[PDB]
Design a protein around this motif. Structure first.
Motif, PDB file in Angstrom:
ATOM      1  N   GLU A   1       1.826   4.001  10.231  1.00  0.00           N
ATOM      2  CA  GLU A   1       0.673   3.603   9.192  1.00  0.00           C
ATOM      3  C   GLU A   1      -0.434   4.509   9.536  1.00  0.00           C
TER       4      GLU A   1
ATOM      5  N   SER B   1       1.090  -1.221   0.040  1.00  0.00           N
ATOM      6  CA  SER B   1       0.069   0.012   0.045  1.00  0.00           C
ATOM      7  C   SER B   1       0.659   1.245   0.050  1.00  0.00           C
TER       8      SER B   1
ATOM      9  N   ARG C   1       0.189   3.666   2.484  1.00  0.00           N
ATOM     10  CA  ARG C   1      -0.456   4.166   3.641  1.00  0.00           C
ATOM     11  C   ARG C   1       0.628   4.045   4.776  1.00  0.00           C
TER      12      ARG C   1
ATOM     13  N   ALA D   1      -4.317   6.668   2.523  1.00  0.00           N
ATOM     14  CA  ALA D   1      -2.847   6.937   1.906  1.00  0.00           C
ATOM     15  C   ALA D   1      -2.905   8.593   1.617  1.00  0.00           C
TER      16      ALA D   1
ATOM     17  N   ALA E   1      -1.035   9.779   4.421  1.00  0.00           N
ATOM     18  CA  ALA E   1       0.254   9.442   4.463  1.00  0.00           C
ATOM     19  C   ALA E   1       1.043  10.650   3.642  1.00  0.00           C
TER      20      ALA E   1
END
Length: 79
Positions: free
Chosen positions: A50, A1, A3, A54, A57
């Motif tokens: 985490e 991912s 993220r 996303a 992030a």
């Protein structure tokens, strides 16, 4: 991912509480991982943060990379 973030350049006393306070402004955090040296008690100067999203992030990287934390320049990238 996309993220999970890698965060390097952490002073020895930076912990999960410190990391959470520095990164929560960007969005909900699912977990924070801080690999430790088993022989010794302390971490190795890096961690993983985490995010639920996303997008959060991404914002975190853009703002936090090469920023200061405990007087140290930290590096933030996608893990």
């Amino acid at each position: 991912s996309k993220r999970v973030l890698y965060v390097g350049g952490l002073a020895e006393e930076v912990d999960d509480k410190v990391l959470h306070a520095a990164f929560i402004p960007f969005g909900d955090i699912t977990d924070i991982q801080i690999p430790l040296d088993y022989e010794t008690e302390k971490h190795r100067g890096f961690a993983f943060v985490e995010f639920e999203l996303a997008e959060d992030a991404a914002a975190a990287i853009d703002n936090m990379n090469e920023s200061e934390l405990f007087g140290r320049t930290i590096r933030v990238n996608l893990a």
